[PDB]
Amino acid sequence: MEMEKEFEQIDKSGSWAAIYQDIRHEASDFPSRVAKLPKNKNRNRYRDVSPFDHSRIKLHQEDNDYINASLIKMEEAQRSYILTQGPLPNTVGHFWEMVWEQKSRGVVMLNRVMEKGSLKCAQYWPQKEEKEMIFEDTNLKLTLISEDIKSYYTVRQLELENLTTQETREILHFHYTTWPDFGVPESPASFLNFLFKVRESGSLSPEHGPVVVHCSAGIGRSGTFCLADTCLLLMDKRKDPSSVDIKKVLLEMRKFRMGLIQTADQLRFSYLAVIEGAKFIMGD
Numbered sequence: 233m234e235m236e237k238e239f240e241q242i243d244k245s246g247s248w249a250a251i252y253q254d255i256r257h258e259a260s261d262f263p264s265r266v267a268k269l270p271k272n273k274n275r276n277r278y279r280d281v282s283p284f285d286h287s288r289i290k291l292h293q294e295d296n297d298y299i300n301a302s303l304i305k306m307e308e309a310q311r312s313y314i315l316t317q318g319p320l321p322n323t324v325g326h327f328w329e330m331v332w333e334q335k336s337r338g339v340v341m342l343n344r345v346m347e348k349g350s351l352k353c354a355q356y357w358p359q360k361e362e363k364e365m366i367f368e369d370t371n372l373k374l375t376l377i378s379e380d381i382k383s384y385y386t387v388r389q390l391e392l393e394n395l396t397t398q399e400t401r402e403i404l405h406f407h408y409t410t411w412p413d414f415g416v417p418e419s420p421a422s423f424l425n426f427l428f429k430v431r432e433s434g435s436l437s438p439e440h441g442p443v444v445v446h447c448s449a450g451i452g453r454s455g456t457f458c459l460a461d462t463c464l465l466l467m468d469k470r471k472d473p474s475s476v477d478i479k480k481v482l483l484e485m486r487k488f489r490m491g492l493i494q495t496a497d498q499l500r501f502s503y504l505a506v507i508e509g510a511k512f513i514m515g516d
């Protein structure tokens with residue numbers, strides 16, 4: 233059923249809450265035993281948001297290999313994403329260790345450091361060229377190279393140095409700065425513009441490790457980003473672009489991380505983004 237028609241049918245009936253609860257009821261449940269170990273309590277921002285054991289990212293250390301991060305592997309679309317929480321004061325070194333070990337080219341950030349007057353994640357990147365950061369726990373150095381500030385998002389070029397081997401890599405930081413403190417954007421135009429900028433960079437492409445995506449918990453805005461990308465890629469590949477079922481793609485993704493898409497308004501916004509984005513994918 234063409235999603236644009238399904239959309240008008242749900243909107244006219246006002247059943248967004250009912251569709252959303254059906255997803256929550258059918259969603260996968262797998263164990264998260266490593267996340268709930270007492271040694272990992274300060275590695276988790278939220279008590280109710282944990283990575284499944286089968287899909288969690290492992291840090292390449294013998295001490296403690298745990299980070300709140302999951303590998304979402306979309307087999308038919310041929311795309312991989314790492315979804316993670318906003319780093320905490322005790323996890324910033326771990327974050328950049330993961331970026332290094334997984335060979336990621338891009339980091340996608342969908343929140344501000346402060347929202348609703350509270351801290352949503354640590355200041356984990358340098359703000360001035362001449363004031364670099366060193367993480368002693370993981371032996372990494374991070375330098376700001378350049379910054380391009382636009383109306384809806386900022387792109388930064390960073391240099392990450394493995395202080396152990398003196399290898400360096402360029403990491404692109406894509407920071408969406410205008411998601412509102414409450415609700416979802418009114419139009420998906422600036423979110424879709426942002427997604428096409430990430431794609432253009434090479435960050436989502438198979439010659440790199442998976443892109444790292446985060447918001448505060450790594451399930452809501454982060455969920456919207458990967459669901460929209462995968463749905464538009466599937467519409468490009470399939471003979472019948474009308475066969476793409478966004479509810480079935482979201483349940484497949486929820487086999488790899490719990491809670492992706494946090495509200496009925498985020499589900500509606502995901503439909504709107506895919507519907508509007510397709511009016512490029514189908515040849516405009």
Ligand SMILES: OCc1ccccc1OC1CCOCC1
Nearest residue numbers: 321324354355356365366367368
């Ligand atoms: O590697 C630790 C570190 C080095 C340089 C600058 C800041 C910094 O850590 C701060 C506290 C913890 O949260 C992030 C900000």
